[PDB]
Amino acid sequence: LEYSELYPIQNEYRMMQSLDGMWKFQFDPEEIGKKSGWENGLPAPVSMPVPSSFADFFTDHKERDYCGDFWYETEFYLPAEWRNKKIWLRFGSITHRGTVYCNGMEITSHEGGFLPVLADISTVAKPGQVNQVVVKINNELNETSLPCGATKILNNGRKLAKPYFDFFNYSGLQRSVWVIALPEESVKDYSVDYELCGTDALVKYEVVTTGEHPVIVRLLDAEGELVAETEGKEGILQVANARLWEVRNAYLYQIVILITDGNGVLDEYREKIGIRTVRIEGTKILLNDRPVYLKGFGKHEDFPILGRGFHWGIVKRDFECLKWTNANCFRTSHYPYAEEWYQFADEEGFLIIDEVPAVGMMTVPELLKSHIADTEEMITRDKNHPSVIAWSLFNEPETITDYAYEYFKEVFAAAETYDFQSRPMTGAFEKNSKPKCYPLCDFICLNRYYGWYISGGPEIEEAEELFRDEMDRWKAKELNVPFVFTEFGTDTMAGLHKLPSIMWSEEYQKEYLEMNFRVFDSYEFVQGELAWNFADFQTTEGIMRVDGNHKGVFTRDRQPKAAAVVFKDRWE
Amino acid sequence: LEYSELYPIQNEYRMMQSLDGMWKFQFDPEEIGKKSGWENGLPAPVSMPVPSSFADFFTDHKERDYCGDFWYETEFYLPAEWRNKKIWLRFGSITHRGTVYCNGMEITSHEGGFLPVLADISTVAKPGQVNQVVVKINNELNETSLPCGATKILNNGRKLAKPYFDFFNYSGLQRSVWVIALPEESVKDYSVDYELCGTDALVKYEVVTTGEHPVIVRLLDAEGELVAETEGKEGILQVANARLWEVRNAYLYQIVILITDGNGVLDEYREKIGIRTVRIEGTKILLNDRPVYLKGFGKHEDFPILGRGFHWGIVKRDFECLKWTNANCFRTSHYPYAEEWYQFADEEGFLIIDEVPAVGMMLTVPELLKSHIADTEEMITRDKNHPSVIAWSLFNEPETITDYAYEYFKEVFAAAETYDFQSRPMTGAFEKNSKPELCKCYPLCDFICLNRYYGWYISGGPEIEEAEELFRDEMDRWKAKELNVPFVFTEFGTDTMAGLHKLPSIMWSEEYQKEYLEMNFRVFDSYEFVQGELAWNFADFQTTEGIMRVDGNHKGVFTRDRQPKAAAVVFKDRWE
């Protein structure tokens, strides 16, 4: 990559300044902004919070449902002391695609709405003055970028997003924005990989910098004491009596990467990491050489009013709820999340399956290029989190064809080359993939709705029989790999009670889950269960979605339905 | 004040760095933190978002309901270039009271949970190094600080807050936190006041600095063009063809205050202001010499999970809802809000009644008065230069029928008048016990605000026809007093459970909310001196648990998520 994915920090060498707050904002239905000079300032803006999705602020349909080009602007004072630094704008994300301008000059463009965008403004920045940033954003969906969909044009020219996926097309500047300053020679990337040797551990590393000066790498324990030190852009740190990062029992070391010259340090990057190994062995998922059974949820970045807007408060509430259920895992369905989710998982000892936005899939070569780019960016961003134990490279694509296999072979090969740890890779399969892609997977993830979309309600005993039929077929294949159910659930309206239960009632959600557990527990090779979904979340409106998706175990406001205690008791 | 209330800005002379994020946090039930070195770092912290209220993150009762001492900590890197500046920690608020430590040193303490706390760390700050801030906070309620209440001790030593007010005792670091650097001689305060002269306007000003060097004051229009310039710490800016700040049609100039040192500048402060006048004339409220009728709501700082935690997203949604109802006003019931609420009201042309947290007051009175006056001074000093702020509310439903009460509020109002350069209208909200011929305090008020619940707490439901008669009987009594002042209803409403429908209506149904409002409007419109209506409440909000509160207060016209009940349209159509 032509930029660093490293999370920004502040020290003697690196500065950061938050651009979060109220930005200027303007819709551009006629696509006239660039030919009207909007990159020099918006002519009739309204105010827009950053970070946030723009949609749910407005009180009118057309602004909520806006699809097309729209623009952000803000101004910021740059300290004079940032002169002679490399100065970058860093967006947590820009959803879905955009072009970044600074002081009227085009800096960079990015396609993909759920990973950082870095814009080098070194040559146009004005230290000791007010500076301007303007972003042209587009939120249309197509079949050559992720996540896939279409754009419908109403007769009057108005655009409407048509997702091929079951979540609302939130967009805008949904994550934090910084302006940062780096030394002229800086740490650009690093990778760690772990080996356990009795009570000791090895931390294998590589460092990439923007120069040729020597690198020193130090490892500090949780109290800031030096436990290992070596020299070179590649090396091994030896840790005596290592304190391993364990499930729901984290321990974090701090890696410190220094660039030096003859007169001292040029750059210092530091980050918390956790010493842990992940391996698949037969039908077992091994964490630090011991089997672990995954227990948890698919989530979303979704909250009232803010949409997918990042807030630490949502992180905190959601993790308190996760711990209360006795969960140990979540999947970032269906896109990489804000970096802070992973930082916090590291602290709390949660396991993450990190998922690229490969949802709604079927121009194929262009789509593959986008898919691989998102994969590279995700892995480069997230590889050094101890919480990230697996990559999910798709959710319910087509998989019953020869070509599809060639496509995913390239995606998996790309993931392998970018992950220094070569950790387990997978993807979630829909039922259409009836018992050549699953061999690419290190473990198999199944999304199943036996008892909801298949033989629901009065037919639930038939659903159980059908479910067992399918699992008996998988069993007979004797693949000797772990199976994880990455989705299962029922739409459930809080307060809808019925005796006997009906589809959509709280009681049915409980009975459905009990049935699924009976099936899961009947097969040795099942090694995880992630319920769909942690919480009710927004979707496109329609005849099958009653104010979004209600398969949450929690409400959107993060309160438990009856079924929540079912998970709590089972996972205890 | 021993510090500046001015909102922090960043330029060549002033620096700022946000401390918002995940802080360290620890409860201190045994009150041993200061005995055990916690001011140098918490021994077993958990993570806590800032800004936010702490209560609603947890999944257990005892942490949610925690009452007593609790601590926050974070670390930050201070740029070497800040050396020998005046360096301050600035908390949007610390709820309710607290002591700020920096690098192990006690810096300042503050009582009052809804206004900025400034801590001067100039002598202990470590430029070019990592620094530590630790805050000891307490959220107990008592009768010598605002808002008033009690603290109950359960059998086992556990404390429980017992408010004398109808909102949940949210607390913590609920607003943004900054570390800032100021020049050694700086602009500490300024005040503006306006006079309209035909098509022109005068901006009268005063500037307070921490030194004796010359001051220059400039006014820029919305395009940044210079329209006026004057010299001195006191003066008048003459604005030709002034573009007035109008209700729901804002225009903002930028005031620029410079301290100069002959061949250079020592400090610069800039802030957006709006040229507007507000007066009471007979029974009318005049904005820029024209009558305005107030239309809107009492609000709260309240939102799912975040509690009172500040977020621009809540501001944006709430103002879009306000505009959709055709409102022009809200009251900051029952405490000053985060500064950003006023900044945005300035931009959107909304009128604000700014309210000090004087609720629950019904030998400790002398201390209470001191606290009340202090909060009043801080509120007015912080908020006076917002064009949106057109009135101060100095109480909500205290005792008012005794002579002691009159003497108490005389001193509060006198303090408020001393601190407001504009001498804009001062008021307070009266509950019904302050009967027309019993009340002693209304003469202090520039206009009178009434909270009334005829049709809810009095003769509700089947008796609503009686409620209306009782309401007219009281207003007839006020009318006969011929006070020649405007009356504003600052509260009226019914608890309403979204989705509860009944024909015929019942108390708590959406239909009854509509009928109650219609009855109230008929009464309002029968009296010429009524000059405003602020409904209680904009949105459902959290309260203490109890048999009278079904997951908080449901008198919202909007749900807590910010979606309209049936009655929202009633307001929209009437206020159009």
Ligand SMILES: O=C(O)[C@H]1O[C@@H](O)[C@H](O)[C@@H](O)[C@@H]1O
């Ligand atoms: O229909 C559903 O609830 C779900 O169906 C699954 O196939 C998708 O993976 C998921 O994102 C949907 O929300």
Ligand SMILES: O=C(O)[C@H]1O[C@@H](O)[C@H](O)[C@@H](O)[C@@H]1O
């Ligand atoms: O009972 C109520 O709903 C309200 O009563 C009024 O007296 C209070 O001023 C207000 O804060 C309460 O919420």
